[PDB]
């Protein structure tokens, strides 16, 4: 049963009455489900996977694009010399879990291998009907509210040897992060997280990094080499507001104690480079009151500096930007096939 491609039925238990846009969108675009999976193991079956070549990711991307476009309307948008203006009311915004259901005559496959790196053969394959609920969190650098690795930390790449390929780190243990625009400079914000917890996280990631690239290698984290503020900082949407957080303090570390919490300084911006398409959008000023989100860091997206030239050293920087890698981080274990 080879991999095939066809339009999918998304899924959500989203409530009809919740005026929040994800619930509102999911009710009109998605189906209730399940009511059951309900069970489908495939004995003695080995299957090759490729999370990096999965039509599901591209299709999902289109669903989340449509959601934002329908839900978070900018006052002004500029794309390809063309200008759009529209009403831009503030909304309630909080990613609900989303499932993705295969249509008739088709079925979904799940990789259950413990070490599974996202490419190549899987020995613990199983079928189903829908992937478990994915929160469509839009962010760079850090993966939020995702699913954790079952055993050890896992890192995945389309080509580890290709420095142009994004490295997806999946943590097996969450690090809580608290971001706030305090009540009563209305665009100034910050995030707090445990310094010690993060150091341990970096350490364990670094350990897996040494395992992949060579134990003779020295592992270094460095800040963004530059670009749009969206990828220089850890950015995310909280409560309809666009947060841009300085992650310098998160990504300055070497092998060779100060402070209980790490505090990242942040800004709320009205003017953003869009992730859905190339362009800029202006939104209305931030809402009043306390703005706060508590999220699980469940993974990371890294890129690695090439080189050479001296070698023996590997430098890693925070990355992201292409949200397809975000969806891939959850859909990596799945593929769609046609029953024949």
């Amino acid at each position: 049963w080879k991999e095939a491609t066809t339009t999918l039925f998304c899924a959500s238990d989203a409530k009809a009455y919740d005026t929040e846009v994800h619930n509102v969108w999911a009710t009109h675009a998605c189906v209730p489900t399940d009511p059951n999976p309900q069970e489908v193991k495939l004995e003695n079956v080995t299957e090759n996977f490729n999370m990096w070549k999965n039509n599901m990711v591209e299709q999902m991307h289109e669903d989340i694009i449509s959601l934002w476009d329908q839900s978070l309307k900018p006052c002004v948008k500029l794309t390809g010399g063309s200008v759009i203006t529209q009403a831009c009311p503030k909304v309630s915004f909080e990613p609900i879990p989303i499932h993705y259901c295969a249509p008739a005559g088709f079925a979904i496959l799940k990789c259950n291998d413990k070490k599974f790196n996202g490419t190549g053969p899987c020995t613990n394959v199983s079928t189903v009907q829908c992937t478990h609920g994915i929160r469509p969190v839009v962010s760079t650098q850090l993966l939020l509210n995702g699913s954790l690795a079952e055993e050890e930390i896992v890192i995945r790449s389309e080509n580890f040897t290709n420095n142009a390929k994004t490295i997806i780190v999946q943590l097996n243990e969450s690090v809580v992060i608290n971001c706030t625009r305090p009540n009563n400079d209305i665009r100034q914000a910050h995030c707090n997280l445990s310094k010690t917890q993060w150091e341990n996280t970096l350490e364990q990631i670094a350990i897996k990094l040494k395992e992949q690239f060579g134990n003779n290698k020295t592992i270094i984290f460095n800040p963004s080499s530059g670009g749009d503020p969206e990828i220089v900082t850890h950015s995310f949407n909280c409560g309809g507001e666009f947060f841009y957080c300085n992650s310098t303090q998160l990504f300055t570390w070497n092998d060779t104690n100060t402070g209980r919490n790490i505090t990242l300084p942040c800004r709320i911006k009205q003017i953003i480079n869009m992730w859905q398409e190339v362009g800029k959008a202006m939104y209305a000023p931030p809402i009043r009151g306390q703005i706060r989100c508590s999220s699980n860091i469940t993974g990371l997206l890294l890129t690695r500096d090439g080189g050479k030239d001296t070698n023996g050293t590997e430098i890693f920087r925070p990355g992201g930007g292409d949200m397809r890698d975000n969806w891939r981080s959850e859909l990596y274990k799945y593929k769609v096939v046609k029953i024949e």
């Epitope: 039925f9 899924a11 238990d13 409530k15 009809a16 009710t27 009109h28 675009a29 998605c30 189906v31 209730p32 489900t33 399940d34 009511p35 059951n36 309900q38 259901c101 008739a104």
Partner: antibody, heavy 118, light 106 residues
């Protein structure tokens, strides 16, 4: 599968409507269960739908007043509506949800006439 | 979202072919069913997903459409076919059309 309904249908304003729907020929397991009402001379209106998990799914025109529930020991489910007014006068139906998970409503209960007046 | 039908109270003779339409205010992809309802009784499922007949429903029934235009068709009305027909959006608010009452011409 057959759905039979019971419950008091003559109510006064500010009272609570409490109807029950019994399912015979099928289990509640892995099945959605819904309520729908039909005001006099008007079209059908979805009230809400439930699941074995416990997630309650209501209509926005009835959020703060409506409760839908499963009675798992009896394979029954119920609808509660508090502070009823004359505008809730309608025939109220229960209905099982067909799967695929394409929906929707089949089979249907026989309906209960509910009249709200003082 | 709004369901708009052909303006009901339609009158047609037995043996005649009849088609009633449902128009949605926004696009919907096969999230649609059609029901038949006679006075004093509960509705019965005729068609869902725009074009799929419910089991037991006679072949003279058919339905098509997607997006904003939908169709319920009876190739040849029988006395038992006379009724009020509703369209319904199968997701979102699960809203119904205002209904099309199908009466006997004479």
């Amino acid at each position: 599968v057959q759905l039979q309904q019971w419950g008091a249908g003559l109510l006064k304003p500010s009272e609570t409507l409490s109807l029950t729907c019994g399912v015979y020929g099928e289990s509640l397991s892995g099945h959605y269960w819904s309520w729908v009402r039909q005001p006099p001379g008007k079209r059908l209106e979805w009230i809400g739908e439930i699941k074995h998990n416990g997630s309650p799914n209501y209509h926005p025109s009835l959020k703060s007043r409506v409760t839908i529930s499963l009675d798992m020991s009896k394979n029954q489910f119920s609808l509660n509506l508090t502070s009823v007014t004359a505008a809730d006068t309608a025939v109220y139906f229960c209905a099982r949800r067909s799967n695929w998970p394409y929906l929707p409503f089949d089979p249907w209960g026989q309906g209960t006439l509910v009249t709200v007046s003082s | 979202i709004q369901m708009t039908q052909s303006p009901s109270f339609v009158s047609a003779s037995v043996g005649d072919r009849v088609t009633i339409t449902c128009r949605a205010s926004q696009g919907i992809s096969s999230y649609l069913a059609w029901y038949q309802q006679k006075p004093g009784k509960a509705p019965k499922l005729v068609i869902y997903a725009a074009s799929t007949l419910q089991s037991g429903v006679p072949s003279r029934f058919s339905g098509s459409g997607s997006g904003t235009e939908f169709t319920l068709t009876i190739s040849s009305l029988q006395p038992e076919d006379f009724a009020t027909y509703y369209c319904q959006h199968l997701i979102g608010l699960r809203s119904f059309g205002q209904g099309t009452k199908l009466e006997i011409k004479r």
